[PDB]
Amino acid sequence: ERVVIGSKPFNEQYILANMIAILLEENGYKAEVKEGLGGTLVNYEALKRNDIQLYVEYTGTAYNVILRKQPPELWDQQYIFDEVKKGLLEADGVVVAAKLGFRDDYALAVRADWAEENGVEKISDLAEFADQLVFGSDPEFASRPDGLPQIKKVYGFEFKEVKQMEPTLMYEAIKNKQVDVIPAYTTDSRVDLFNLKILEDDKGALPPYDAIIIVNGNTAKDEKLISVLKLLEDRIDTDTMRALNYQYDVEKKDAREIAMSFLKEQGLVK
Ligand SMILES: C[N+]1(C)CCC[C@H]1C(=O)O
Ligand SMILES: [Zn+2]
Ligand SMILES: [Zn+2]
Ligand SMILES: [Zn+2]
Ligand SMILES: [Zn+2]
Questions:
Q1: Domain at 196, CATH number
Q2: Are residues 213 and 203 in the same domain?
Q3: Is 153 left (phi over 0), alpha (psi -120 to 50) or beta?
Q4: Which of 24, 98, 109, 217 has minimal CB crowding within 10 Å?
Q5: Cβ 171 under 6 angstroms from ligand 1
Q6: For the chain, how many structural domains are there in total?
Q7: Which of the listed residues 105, 164, 185, 187 should we mutate to test ligand 1's pocket, taking the one with most ligand atoms within 8 A of CB?
Q8: Which residue range is the domain that position 35 belongs to?
Q9: Which atom of ligand 1 is nearest to the CA of 209?
Q10: Please, what is the Cα angle at 100 between 98 and 104, to 5 degrees?
């Protein structure tokens, strides 16, 4: 069988898509990573129509963006998981094959020297300044229901200007003062490297984003394939994902080679 794996445009998507490809290839499959489709909704549409067979999604995204479910009073990681697994199955036959073992959350970040000068530590501290700050979005956060609309609704403010750019460009943009705030990805060590400060989400606006492998209904009938995917259950924690991402964004290593090195070290390929 030919297995096509989707990807959103950033480090860990490339790495994990290649890591899954390698594992599937080791178990008799022909696997390929498909790049360039776009973001969340284009990948999920492609999965439903069988253009792709699986990709790496996140619980909070599936809940808010795909299932368009209503935020509960308090975010609970396992509740959101349980409802995404039920909800994806009920709606489109999509199966949650595995939990990878890490969260990659959106977290609002600013420059650390500015934050220290202004006593900013939490998102609600931004209220004073927000209408004078430029927001640098990735392709999705500005328009997603759990993005800037959710910050507006929960915290009661909007930024002065919104610019959108591909995910990896956010970190240099804020460092170089092209923007003042970004929805940094928490598995990206460029937050520390470029002297940025992640702010506490003190009013609990944003959900947990636990990485999960999702598979379309027809592909999931393949029990051998599902069981290869489950070899990765809980195997990748946040510090591991961050290390691998660094090898991609800073060391400029090829995603296939980063994945291959990890699989060998963990004994998943000999
Ligand atoms: C992983 N996230 C929740 C944070 C980074 C991009 C977004 C998503 O891919 O849904
Ligand atoms: Zn003002
Ligand atoms: Zn588990
Ligand atoms: Zn670890
Ligand atoms: Zn070896």
A1: 3.40.190.120
A2: no
A3: alpha
A4: 217
A5: no
A6: 2
A7: 185
A8: 1-104+209-270
A9: 3
A10: 130
